[PDB]
Amino acid sequence: QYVAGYKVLPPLMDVNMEAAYTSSLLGSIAGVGWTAGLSSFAAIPFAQS
Amino acid sequence: IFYRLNGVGITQQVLSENQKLIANKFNQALGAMQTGFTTTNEAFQKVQD
């Protein structure tokens, strides 16, 4: 990919950050899905969700 | 607007007592984008594109 005369751009996020994003999503799925409306947060433990 | 705000999960008490401030907020929100028609707006950029 170097000798043939092109390049591959790095992604917009580091791996490390993509991850956070998924950690935040995993923390929020247990809470958002309890009542309609994104304004509040209700992060109940997963079993009761 | 009052019925929709009741429907999106806001109680009728605060709507019944605070019409003036939410009216001012709505008017300011509508008036803000009137002068915002420039390069900073993404939809304006998409229209130009």
Side-chain angles (χ1 to χ4, degrees):
Chain A
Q1 71 85 25
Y2 276 141
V3 68
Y6 53 85
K7 85 184 298 180
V8 165
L9 272 300
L12 183 62
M13 311 306 307
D14 276 326
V15 167
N16 266 7
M17 225 181 109
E18 237 121 307
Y21 273 125
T22 47
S23 305
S24 64
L25 214 53
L26 185 74
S28 58
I29 45 160
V32 176
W34 201 64
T35 315
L38 296 175
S39 313
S40 89
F41 196 37
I44 306 309
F46 208 81
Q48 204 156 3
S49 185
Chain B
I1 301 299
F2 295 152
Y3 269 106
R4 288 204 210 193
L5 281 190
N6 171 45
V8 295
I10 319 166
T11 176
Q12 205 73 24
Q13 158 70 252
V14 60
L15 272 297
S16 298
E17 63 89 20
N18 205 6
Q19 297 91 323
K20 302 287 117 175
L21 190 69
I22 69 168
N24 290 1
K25 276 174 188 175
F26 192 75
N27 200 357
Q28 186 261 337
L30 268 294
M33 54 78 69
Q34 202 269 341
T35 187
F37 276 5
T38 182
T39 316
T40 76
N41 280 352
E42 197 53 52
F44 201 93
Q45 273 319 112
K46 285 226 272 197
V47 161
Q48 212 51 68
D49 274 331

